[PDB]
């Protein structure tokens, strides 16, 4: 089916050739706001910026390194953003608020092979809530479900102005290395379906916010798999979804999505395995959970 094209590329060993092609064919749009001097300290990497046409605007300086990926045919939107900086934690939650997101998926760790990939932007203790005074927000850990390779936290975001509050679900994947891949499709798809079940992806909410270190590599992998599985179901045809065309479509909205040839391969592996659920084998989901060893 689609399992054809994968068995082929694996034998001929041409994954990097495929990946290099996407880099060549990918959109290239202006990033002028991101390159302004006043925004130098709001970008974590000098070669990773949001396109002007799809960048999120704070309702304030309105700049944040984050992009709205609006997949029209899949009928889902995501916001991909960089791991917040010490100075952009208030902007990040300002964004989450103004865009009405319900979920945040974080695929990196704050500490990653000695390198600091992210600021501690959410509170780790119920009793020590965070207050972001530049954006007038207050953030409180309410509860947390810790699993072997990921943690779900429940948070309360308070708009200190209006005093309204919202519940935000934080899904933190802790065993996904930079420029690397998850341990197995089951552990990934189990994670993805956890996020799906929470309702955080439902369209009555704003786009889910997805980030890693740069918001392009692991974040790209997570969003491509989810969208491919969405198109599988909508089109009602597994072997109809062409991962390459989908990834290029996502790259109209943010540069550099999917960071290694292996991450692209895993993307195929995950969509192929995920089709079992889409085709009707609704019970493969329980298989993924047991395979993922999420307990202890």
């Amino acid at each position: 089916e689609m399992e054809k094209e994968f068995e082929q590329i694996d034998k001929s060993g041409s994954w990097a050739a495929i990946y290099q092609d996407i880099r060549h064919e990918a959109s290239d749009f202006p990033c002028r706001v991101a390159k302004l001097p006043k925004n130098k300290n709001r970008n974590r990497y000098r070669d990773v910026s949001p396109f002007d046409h799809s960048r999120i605007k704070l309702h304030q300086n309105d700049y944040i390194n984050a992009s709205l990926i609006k997949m029209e045919e899949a009928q889902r939107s995501y916001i991909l953003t960089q791991g917040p900086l010490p100075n952009t934690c208030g902007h990040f939650w300002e964004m989450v608020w103004e865009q009405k997101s319900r979920g945040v998926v974080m695929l990196n760790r704050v500490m990653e092979k000695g390198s600091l990939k992210c600021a501690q932007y959410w509170p780790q203790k119920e009793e020590k809530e965070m207050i972001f005074e530049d954006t007038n927000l207050k953030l409180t850990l309410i509860s947390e479900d810790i699993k072997s390779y990921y943690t779900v936290r429940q948070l309360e975001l308070e708009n200190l102005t209006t005093q309204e509050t919202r519940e935000i679900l934080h899904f933190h994947y802790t065993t996904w290395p930079a420029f690397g891949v998850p341990e197995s499709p089951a552990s990934f798809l189990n994670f993805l379906f956890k996020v799906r079940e929470s309702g955080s992806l439902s369209p009555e909410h704003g786009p889910v916010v997805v980030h890693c270190s740069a918001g392009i590599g692991r974040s790209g992998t997570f969003c491509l798999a989810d969208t491919c599985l969405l198109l599988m179901d909508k089109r009602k045809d597994p072997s109809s979804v062409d991962i390459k065309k989908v990834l290029l479509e996502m790259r109209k909205f943010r540069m550099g999505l999917i960071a290694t040839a292996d991450q692209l391969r895993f993307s195929y592996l995950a969509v192929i395995e995920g089709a079992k659920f889409i085709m009707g084998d609704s019970s493969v989901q329980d298989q993924w959970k047991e395979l993922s060893h999420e307990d202890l």
């Binding site: 974590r44 990497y45 000098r46 070669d47 990773v48 740069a214 392009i216 550099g256």
Partner: peptide
């Protein structure tokens, strides 16, 4: 460094 490379 501070390049994604």
């Amino acid at each position: 460094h501070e390049y994604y490379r």
